[PDB]
Amino acid sequence: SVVPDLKELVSTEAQIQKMSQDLQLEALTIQSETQFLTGINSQAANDCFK
Amino acid sequence: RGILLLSNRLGQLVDLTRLLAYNYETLMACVTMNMQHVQTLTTEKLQLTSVTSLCMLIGNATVIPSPQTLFHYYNVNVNFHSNYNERINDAVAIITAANR
Amino acid sequence: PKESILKKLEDIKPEQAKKQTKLFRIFEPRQLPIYRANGEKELRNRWYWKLKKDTLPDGDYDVREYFLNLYDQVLTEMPDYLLLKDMAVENKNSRDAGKVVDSETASICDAIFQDEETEGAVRRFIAEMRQRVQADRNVVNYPSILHPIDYAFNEYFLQHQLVEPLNNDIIFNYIPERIRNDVNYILNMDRNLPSTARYIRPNLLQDRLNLHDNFESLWDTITTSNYILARSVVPDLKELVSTEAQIQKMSQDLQLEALTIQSETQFLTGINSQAANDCFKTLIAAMLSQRTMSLDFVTTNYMSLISGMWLLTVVPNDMFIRESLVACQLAIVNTIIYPAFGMQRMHYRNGDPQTPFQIAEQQIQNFQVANWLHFVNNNQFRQVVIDGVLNQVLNDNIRDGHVINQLMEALMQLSRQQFPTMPVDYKRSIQRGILLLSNRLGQLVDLTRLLAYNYETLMACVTMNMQHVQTLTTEKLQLTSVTSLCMLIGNATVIPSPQTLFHYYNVNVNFHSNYNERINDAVAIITAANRLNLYQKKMKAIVEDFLKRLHIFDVARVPDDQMYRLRDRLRLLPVEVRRLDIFNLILMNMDQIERASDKIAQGVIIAYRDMQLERDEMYGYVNIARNLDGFQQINLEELMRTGDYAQITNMLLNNQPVALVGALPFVTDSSVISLIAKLDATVFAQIVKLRKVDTLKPILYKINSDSNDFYLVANYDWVPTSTTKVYKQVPQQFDFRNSMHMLTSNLTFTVYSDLLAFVSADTVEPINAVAFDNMRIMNEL
């Protein structure tokens, strides 16, 4: 109830996108799309923080 | 490659440390109840999901506890305490009487 | 899109000949009444200096930032060179025309030359004040009036003119030191440059940013770019065995049938009148740009593999990604060489990492086979530096470059494994494909030559010191096309059109120039940004613009991170004389500017004790101290920052002699009264109520019993008692005679852009071209 909410974050989309460029996601490895359920960060961080 | 994203950002990750450092170190100040470290019976789920986000995802942001906010906090624990202590007395008093 | 990142490239015109007109001044002289001690207006009036545009703000911080913008403005207007023929004007007076410099200069003269000035000496001077030319040196002499600070500027602008000469020889010299030398080409020009030539210098220092260490993301984007650029060049192949014909004899040599399949899967290789051109281009750029590609094969198409061996013998494996060389080799090793060389036994078991070609080397014996292995395996790029200036070219092992005893050996080794075996038939289909390389080997010898040259040619014109890392977008290449190019070529001889080559140079050039330039533009700012304590102009700012100015990069689509790290490196970078040399100038006088000009002050004192006032001429005599000698202080900037510790609050409450400092709003009053009433002590109270101040408008008392309808007091006899004066220097006065300076420049210039164009480039007949060995490239009928 107290822990101040955060502000000025990096656009969700922007980062995750440079992320795929860097991440080399789908490169053989079978167990895809489990590292990107990361999203809702604009939230997740606030939650993780509090 | 992933590791690097921690590193570059590291210049900022720093910022995180400072943040908490302060906040906890601040808020805390206004707690009357003592607090011995105990192995609670219950947990609290923390998805590395969010964690990871906070991490590479924080900019030159800077937030802290609103004055008014802080007090409100003190105030509460306070009352609570007062009640605990008080009832305690109210309690004891009776019980002892109850005996003689 | 494919050719949507190319229009963002060829459309980059960084070559901008920056020039100027208006002489850069900041303060125009102006009128104002004279107030002799005693305070009367003695008439005649005098001329002083006040700034054009008092913009200056409230708050030391806002001030500092303001100047900063000036720096940005200075640079964007930074005169790349000068010339005054274009600055003419006419003196209304003098021994004659006179032609002076800049309208303002003119005005002023005519002006003073009427309003009863200091007489003679002035009018006089204004007269025998003119121009004069010393043709013999191209020099020019023009008179000009400015201000110590003005001569200051304009001066250096003259003593630096980033414009050198330009003789035939220099043009010749800017044509890559390995092309003028390459025989196969010729050059010729249609004109003889005048002694009046000039040329700008596209500067191209190295990646002062080592954009490859950690930033991979960006390299990939560069490579890509540099790559497309290359294809745009890569010559389009010529005449090669009509598709149908070859593929037809192809079916023959092998012996086909009905449900008896073998070689049949080695023909989705047909299309080459598309594949060969693609495979060809693709290969070069890859190298040049230095991009890393992948591999799309099939385990049933062995032919497609054979050709692989063609490839691999070439491009030093490191050029291909890891997981690709891995597949490839093992596929060869386990289905082509062991399996029909009675060496099967163990169909070769490999379980990831270490090197699979390699290990086959130290395993089986056979010389022919054995040389291939070492030459291929340990084959790499020759990390070469200088090439007629820090080109830093990754080169191809002399050997390969046409001294293709590689190909001949690659074939001899193939001519000798086709001896032993195991699964009866299988050998039929495999060795038959192998032979198709051998007959063609007369021509294969060629393909090598081609690339050899091309890459080795195009090369030179890449000031962008390319290196050797790992891409991350991995361009895709099929053994399909490869295989096509291979058997389907010969007789032909192709080469880089002149015009083509230049165009290439030109681009990288600009680009470079931009990179280097923005870099300087970048640095300059940042450093300035520091000796200014702007703890609030959060830099996420500069980086952004920077990147943008070199289109290609989708700014919004790139995180804050990398960006900072980008600053971290920039910070350690030296500025450039030009850039630097100017900032030193702005600061050095900074003070002087601020102090002068109205709308602002500096600070105020509060001595709770009656006291005198200076008797300056400009203003009547008022509340001013140019020293604040003694008393204490308190930076306001740090105050409203820190949050005020009632330190001030207390002193104000208790009344103690004190001073204040920083940007401030002055306020002029008249009716003496105000003073006797001591109004000036009021104002302060406020603060007490509001921790912060800006609502603080201090007071000044312009007192000249002349214009102050309340002279009633100047009467008796007096002498100005005040409590609290103001920190603010005094607008200097104007000494014309000296105020003027003299100027030098040049007459009739001749600036040129682009260059090159001045040459008609021709080419020898294809049939007899030459490589770095003086041998006819393409000598197999």
CSV table of N, CA and C in Angstrom, one decimal, chain C residues 365-471:
chain,number,residue,atom,x,y,z
C,365,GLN,N,44.7,-41.4,-44.0
C,365,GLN,CA,45.9,-41.1,-44.8
C,365,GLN,C,45.7,-41.2,-46.3
C,366,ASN,N,46.3,-40.2,-47.0
C,366,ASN,CA,46.2,-40.1,-48.4
C,366,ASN,C,46.8,-38.7,-48.6
C,367,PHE,N,47.8,-38.5,-49.5
C,367,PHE,CA,48.3,-37.2,-49.6
C,367,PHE,C,47.4,-36.2,-50.2
C,368,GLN,N,47.0,-36.4,-51.5
C,368,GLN,CA,46.1,-35.5,-52.1
C,368,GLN,C,45.0,-35.1,-51.1
C,369,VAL,N,44.2,-36.1,-50.6
C,369,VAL,CA,43.2,-35.8,-49.6
C,369,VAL,C,43.8,-35.0,-48.5
C,370,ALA,N,44.9,-35.4,-48.0
C,370,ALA,CA,45.6,-34.7,-46.9
C,370,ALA,C,46.0,-33.3,-47.0
C,371,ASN,N,46.3,-32.8,-48.2
C,371,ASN,CA,46.6,-31.4,-48.3
C,371,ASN,C,45.4,-30.5,-48.2
C,372,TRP,N,44.3,-31.0,-48.8
C,372,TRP,CA,43.0,-30.3,-48.8
C,372,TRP,C,42.7,-29.9,-47.4
C,373,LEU,N,42.7,-30.9,-46.5
C,373,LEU,CA,42.4,-30.7,-45.1
C,373,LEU,C,43.2,-29.6,-44.4
C,374,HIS,N,44.5,-29.6,-44.5
C,374,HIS,CA,45.2,-28.5,-43.8
C,374,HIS,C,45.0,-27.2,-44.4
C,375,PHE,N,45.0,-27.1,-45.8
C,375,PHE,CA,44.8,-25.9,-46.4
C,375,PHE,C,43.4,-25.3,-46.2
C,376,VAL,N,42.4,-26.1,-46.1
C,376,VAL,CA,41.0,-25.7,-45.8
C,376,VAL,C,40.8,-25.3,-44.4
C,377,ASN,N,41.1,-26.2,-43.6
C,377,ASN,CA,41.0,-26.1,-42.1
C,377,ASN,C,41.7,-24.9,-41.6
C,378,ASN,N,43.0,-24.8,-41.7
C,378,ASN,CA,43.7,-23.7,-41.2
C,378,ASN,C,43.8,-22.4,-42.1
C,379,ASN,N,42.9,-22.4,-43.1
C,379,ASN,CA,42.8,-21.3,-44.0
C,379,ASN,C,42.1,-20.1,-43.4
C,380,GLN,N,42.7,-19.0,-43.4
C,380,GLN,CA,42.0,-17.8,-42.8
C,380,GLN,C,42.3,-16.6,-43.6
C,381,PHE,N,41.9,-15.4,-43.0
C,381,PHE,CA,42.1,-14.2,-43.6
C,381,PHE,C,43.4,-13.6,-43.1
C,382,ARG,N,44.0,-12.8,-44.0
C,382,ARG,CA,45.3,-12.2,-43.6
C,382,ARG,C,44.9,-10.8,-43.1
C,383,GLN,N,45.0,-10.6,-41.8
C,383,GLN,CA,44.6,-9.3,-41.2
C,383,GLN,C,45.6,-8.2,-41.6
C,384,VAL,N,45.4,-7.6,-42.8
C,384,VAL,CA,46.2,-6.5,-43.3
C,384,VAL,C,45.8,-5.1,-42.9
C,385,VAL,N,46.8,-4.3,-42.6
C,385,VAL,CA,46.5,-2.9,-42.2
C,385,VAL,C,46.5,-2.0,-43.4
C,386,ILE,N,47.4,-1.0,-43.4
C,386,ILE,CA,47.5,0.0,-44.5
C,386,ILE,C,47.4,-0.5,-45.9
C,387,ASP,N,46.8,0.4,-46.8
C,387,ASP,CA,46.5,0.1,-48.2
C,387,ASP,C,46.4,1.4,-48.9
C,388,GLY,N,47.4,2.3,-48.6
C,388,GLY,CA,47.3,3.6,-49.2
C,388,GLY,C,46.4,4.4,-48.2
C,389,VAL,N,46.7,4.1,-46.9
C,389,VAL,CA,46.0,4.7,-45.8
C,389,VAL,C,45.1,3.7,-45.0
C,390,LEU,N,45.1,3.7,-43.7
C,390,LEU,CA,44.4,2.8,-42.8
C,390,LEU,C,43.1,2.2,-43.3
C,391,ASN,N,43.2,1.4,-44.3
C,391,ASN,CA,42.0,0.7,-44.9
C,391,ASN,C,41.6,-0.5,-44.0
C,392,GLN,N,42.6,-1.1,-43.5
C,392,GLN,CA,42.4,-2.2,-42.6
C,392,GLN,C,41.5,-3.2,-43.3
C,393,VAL,N,42.0,-3.8,-44.3
C,393,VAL,CA,41.3,-4.7,-45.2
C,393,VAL,C,41.6,-6.2,-44.8
C,394,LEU,N,40.5,-7.0,-44.7
C,394,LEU,CA,40.6,-8.4,-44.4
C,394,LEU,C,40.9,-9.0,-45.8
C,395,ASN,N,42.1,-9.5,-46.0
C,395,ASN,CA,42.4,-10.1,-47.3
C,395,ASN,C,42.4,-11.6,-47.4
C,396,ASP,N,42.3,-12.0,-48.6
C,396,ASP,CA,42.3,-13.4,-49.0
C,396,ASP,C,43.7,-13.9,-49.3
C,397,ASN,N,44.1,-15.0,-48.6
C,397,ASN,CA,45.4,-15.6,-48.7
C,397,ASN,C,46.0,-15.6,-50.1
C,398,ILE,N,46.9,-14.7,-50.4
C,398,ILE,CA,47.6,-14.5,-51.7
C,398,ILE,C,47.2,-15.8,-52.6
C,399,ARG,N,47.8,-16.9,-52.2
C,399,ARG,CA,47.5,-18.2,-52.8
C,399,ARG,C,46.3,-18.2,-53.6
C,400,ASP,N,45.2,-18.4,-52.9
C,400,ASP,CA,43.9,-18.5,-53.5
C,400,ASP,C,43.7,-17.5,-54.6
C,401,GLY,N,43.9,-16.3,-54.4
C,401,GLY,CA,43.8,-15.2,-55.4
C,401,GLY,C,44.4,-15.6,-56.7
C,402,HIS,N,43.7,-16.3,-57.5
C,402,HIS,CA,44.1,-16.8,-58.9
C,402,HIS,C,45.2,-17.8,-58.9
C,403,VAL,N,46.2,-17.8,-57.9
C,403,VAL,CA,47.3,-18.8,-57.9
C,403,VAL,C,46.5,-20.0,-57.3
C,404,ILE,N,45.4,-20.3,-58.0
C,404,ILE,CA,44.5,-21.3,-57.7
C,404,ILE,C,45.0,-22.8,-57.8
C,405,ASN,N,46.3,-23.0,-57.4
C,405,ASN,CA,46.8,-24.3,-57.5
C,405,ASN,C,46.0,-25.1,-56.4
C,406,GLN,N,45.0,-24.4,-55.9
C,406,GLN,CA,44.1,-24.9,-54.8
C,406,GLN,C,43.0,-25.7,-55.6
C,407,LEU,N,42.4,-25.1,-56.5
C,407,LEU,CA,41.3,-25.7,-57.3
C,407,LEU,C,41.9,-27.0,-58.0
C,408,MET,N,43.1,-26.8,-58.6
C,408,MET,CA,43.7,-27.9,-59.3
C,408,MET,C,44.0,-29.0,-58.3
C,409,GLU,N,44.4,-28.7,-57.1
C,409,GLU,CA,44.6,-29.6,-56.1
C,409,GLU,C,43.3,-30.2,-55.6
C,410,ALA,N,42.3,-29.3,-55.5
C,410,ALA,CA,41.0,-29.8,-55.0
C,410,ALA,C,40.4,-30.8,-56.0
C,411,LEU,N,40.8,-30.7,-57.2
C,411,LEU,CA,40.4,-31.6,-58.2
C,411,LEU,C,41.2,-32.9,-58.2
C,412,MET,N,42.6,-32.7,-58.1
C,412,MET,CA,43.4,-33.9,-58.1
C,412,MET,C,43.0,-34.9,-56.9
C,413,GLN,N,42.7,-34.3,-55.8
C,413,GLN,CA,42.3,-35.1,-54.7
C,413,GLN,C,41.0,-35.8,-54.9
C,414,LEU,N,40.1,-35.3,-55.7
C,414,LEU,CA,38.8,-35.9,-56.1
C,414,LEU,C,39.1,-37.0,-57.2
C,415,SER,N,40.1,-36.8,-58.0
C,415,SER,CA,40.4,-37.7,-59.0
C,415,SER,C,41.0,-39.0,-58.4
C,416,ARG,N,41.4,-39.0,-57.2
C,416,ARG,CA,41.9,-40.2,-56.5
C,416,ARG,C,41.2,-40.9,-55.4
C,417,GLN,N,40.0,-40.4,-55.0
C,417,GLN,CA,39.3,-41.2,-53.9
C,417,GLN,C,38.4,-42.1,-54.7
C,418,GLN,N,38.0,-41.6,-55.9
C,418,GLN,CA,37.1,-42.4,-56.7
C,418,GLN,C,37.8,-43.7,-57.2
C,419,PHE,N,38.4,-44.4,-56.2
C,419,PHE,CA,39.1,-45.7,-56.4
C,419,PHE,C,38.4,-46.9,-55.6
C,420,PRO,N,38.5,-46.8,-54.2
C,420,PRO,CA,37.9,-47.9,-53.4
C,420,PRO,C,36.3,-47.8,-53.1
C,421,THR,N,35.7,-48.7,-52.4
C,421,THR,CA,34.3,-48.6,-52.0
C,421,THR,C,33.7,-49.7,-51.1
C,422,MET,N,32.4,-49.6,-50.9
C,422,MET,CA,31.6,-50.5,-50.1
C,422,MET,C,30.2,-50.9,-50.6
C,423,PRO,N,29.2,-49.9,-50.6
C,423,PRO,CA,27.9,-50.3,-51.0
C,423,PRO,C,27.9,-50.2,-52.6
C,424,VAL,N,28.1,-51.3,-53.3
C,424,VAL,CA,28.1,-51.4,-54.7
C,424,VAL,C,27.8,-50.3,-55.7
C,425,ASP,N,26.5,-50.0,-55.8
C,425,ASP,CA,26.0,-48.9,-56.7
C,425,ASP,C,26.5,-47.5,-56.1
C,426,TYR,N,25.7,-46.9,-55.2
C,426,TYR,CA,26.0,-45.6,-54.5
C,426,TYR,C,27.2,-45.0,-55.1
C,427,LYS,N,28.3,-45.7,-55.4
C,427,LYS,CA,29.5,-45.1,-55.9
C,427,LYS,C,29.1,-44.6,-57.3
C,428,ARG,N,28.3,-45.3,-58.1
C,428,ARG,CA,28.0,-44.8,-59.4
C,428,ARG,C,27.5,-43.3,-59.4
C,429,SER,N,26.4,-43.1,-58.6
C,429,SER,CA,25.9,-41.7,-58.6
C,429,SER,C,26.8,-40.7,-58.0
C,430,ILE,N,27.6,-41.1,-57.0
C,430,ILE,CA,28.5,-40.2,-56.4
C,430,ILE,C,29.7,-39.8,-57.2
C,431,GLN,N,30.4,-40.8,-57.8
C,431,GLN,CA,31.5,-40.5,-58.6
C,431,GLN,C,31.2,-39.8,-59.9
C,432,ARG,N,30.0,-40.1,-60.5
C,432,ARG,CA,29.6,-39.5,-61.7
C,432,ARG,C,29.4,-37.9,-61.5
C,433,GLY,N,28.9,-37.6,-60.3
C,433,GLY,CA,28.7,-36.1,-60.0
C,433,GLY,C,30.1,-35.5,-59.9
C,434,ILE,N,31.0,-36.3,-59.2
C,434,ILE,CA,32.3,-35.8,-59.0
C,434,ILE,C,33.0,-35.4,-60.3
C,435,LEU,N,32.8,-36.2,-61.3
C,435,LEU,CA,33.4,-36.0,-62.6
C,435,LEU,C,32.9,-34.7,-63.2
C,436,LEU,N,31.7,-34.3,-63.0
C,436,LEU,CA,31.1,-33.1,-63.6
C,436,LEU,C,31.9,-31.9,-63.1
C,437,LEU,N,32.6,-32.0,-62.0
C,437,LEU,CA,33.4,-30.8,-61.5
C,437,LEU,C,34.8,-30.8,-62.2
C,438,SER,N,35.3,-32.0,-62.4
C,438,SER,CA,36.6,-32.2,-63.1
C,438,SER,C,36.7,-31.6,-64.5
C,439,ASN,N,35.8,-32.0,-65.4
C,439,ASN,CA,35.7,-31.5,-66.8
C,439,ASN,C,35.6,-30.0,-66.8
C,440,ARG,N,34.7,-29.6,-65.9
C,440,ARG,CA,34.4,-28.2,-65.7
C,440,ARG,C,35.6,-27.5,-65.0
C,441,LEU,N,36.4,-28.2,-64.4
C,441,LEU,CA,37.6,-27.7,-63.6
C,441,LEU,C,38.4,-26.7,-64.5
C,442,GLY,N,38.3,-26.9,-65.8
C,442,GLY,CA,39.0,-26.0,-66.6
C,442,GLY,C,38.3,-24.6,-66.4
C,443,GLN,N,37.0,-24.7,-66.2
C,443,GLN,CA,36.3,-23.4,-66.0
C,443,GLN,C,36.2,-23.0,-64.6
C,444,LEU,N,36.1,-24.0,-63.7
C,444,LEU,CA,36.1,-23.7,-62.3
C,444,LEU,C,37.3,-22.9,-61.9
C,445,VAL,N,38.4,-23.2,-62.5
C,445,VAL,CA,39.6,-22.4,-62.3
C,445,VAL,C,39.3,-21.0,-62.4
C,446,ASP,N,38.3,-20.7,-63.3
C,446,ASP,CA,37.9,-19.3,-63.5
C,446,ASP,C,37.1,-18.7,-62.4
C,447,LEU,N,35.9,-19.2,-62.1
C,447,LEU,CA,35.1,-18.6,-61.0
C,447,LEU,C,36.0,-18.0,-59.9
C,448,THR,N,37.0,-18.8,-59.5
C,448,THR,CA,37.9,-18.3,-58.5
C,448,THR,C,38.5,-17.0,-58.9
C,449,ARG,N,39.0,-16.9,-60.1
C,449,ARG,CA,39.7,-15.7,-60.6
C,449,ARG,C,38.7,-14.6,-60.4
C,450,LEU,N,37.5,-14.8,-61.0
C,450,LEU,CA,36.5,-13.8,-60.9
C,450,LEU,C,36.4,-13.2,-59.5
C,451,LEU,N,35.8,-13.9,-58.6
C,451,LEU,CA,35.7,-13.4,-57.2
C,451,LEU,C,37.1,-12.7,-56.8
C,452,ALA,N,38.1,-13.6,-56.9
C,452,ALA,CA,39.5,-13.1,-56.5
C,452,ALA,C,39.6,-11.7,-56.9
C,453,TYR,N,39.5,-11.4,-58.1
C,453,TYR,CA,39.6,-10.0,-58.6
C,453,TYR,C,38.5,-9.1,-57.9
C,454,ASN,N,37.3,-9.2,-58.4
C,454,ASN,CA,36.2,-8.4,-57.9
C,454,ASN,C,36.3,-8.0,-56.4
C,455,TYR,N,36.3,-9.0,-55.5
C,455,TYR,CA,36.4,-8.6,-54.1
C,455,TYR,C,37.7,-7.8,-54.0
C,456,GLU,N,38.8,-8.4,-54.3
C,456,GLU,CA,40.1,-7.8,-54.3
C,456,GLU,C,40.1,-6.4,-54.9
C,457,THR,N,39.1,-6.1,-55.8
C,457,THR,CA,39.0,-4.8,-56.4
C,457,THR,C,38.1,-3.9,-55.6
C,458,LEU,N,36.8,-4.1,-55.7
C,458,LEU,CA,35.9,-3.3,-55.0
C,458,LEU,C,36.5,-2.9,-53.7
C,459,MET,N,37.1,-3.8,-52.9
C,459,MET,CA,37.8,-3.6,-51.7
C,459,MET,C,38.2,-2.1,-51.5
C,460,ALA,N,39.4,-1.8,-51.9
C,460,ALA,CA,40.0,-0.5,-51.8
C,460,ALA,C,39.1,0.6,-51.4
C,461,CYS,N,38.1,0.9,-52.2
C,461,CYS,CA,37.1,1.9,-51.9
C,461,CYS,C,36.2,1.8,-50.7
C,462,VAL,N,36.8,1.3,-49.6
C,462,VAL,CA,36.0,1.1,-48.4
C,462,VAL,C,36.7,1.7,-47.2
C,463,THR,N,36.6,3.0,-47.0
C,463,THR,CA,37.3,3.7,-45.9
C,463,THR,C,36.8,3.2,-44.6
C,464,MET,N,35.7,2.5,-44.6
C,464,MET,CA,35.1,2.0,-43.4
C,464,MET,C,35.8,0.7,-42.9
C,465,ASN,N,37.0,0.9,-42.3
C,465,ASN,CA,37.7,-0.2,-41.8
C,465,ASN,C,36.9,-1.4,-41.3
C,466,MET,N,36.6,-2.3,-42.2
C,466,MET,CA,35.8,-3.5,-41.8
C,466,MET,C,36.6,-4.5,-41.0
C,467,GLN,N,36.0,-5.3,-40.1
C,467,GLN,CA,36.7,-6.2,-39.3
C,467,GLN,C,36.2,-7.6,-39.5
C,468,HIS,N,36.2,-8.4,-38.4
C,468,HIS,CA,35.8,-9.8,-38.5
C,468,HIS,C,35.0,-10.3,-37.3
C,469,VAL,N,33.7,-10.0,-37.3
C,469,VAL,CA,32.9,-10.5,-36.1
C,469,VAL,C,31.8,-11.4,-36.6
C,470,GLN,N,30.8,-11.5,-35.8
C,470,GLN,CA,29.6,-12.4,-36.1
C,470,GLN,C,28.4,-11.6,-36.3
C,471,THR,N,27.8,-11.7,-37.5
C,471,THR,CA,26.5,-11.0,-37.7
C,471,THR,C,25.5,-11.6,-36.9
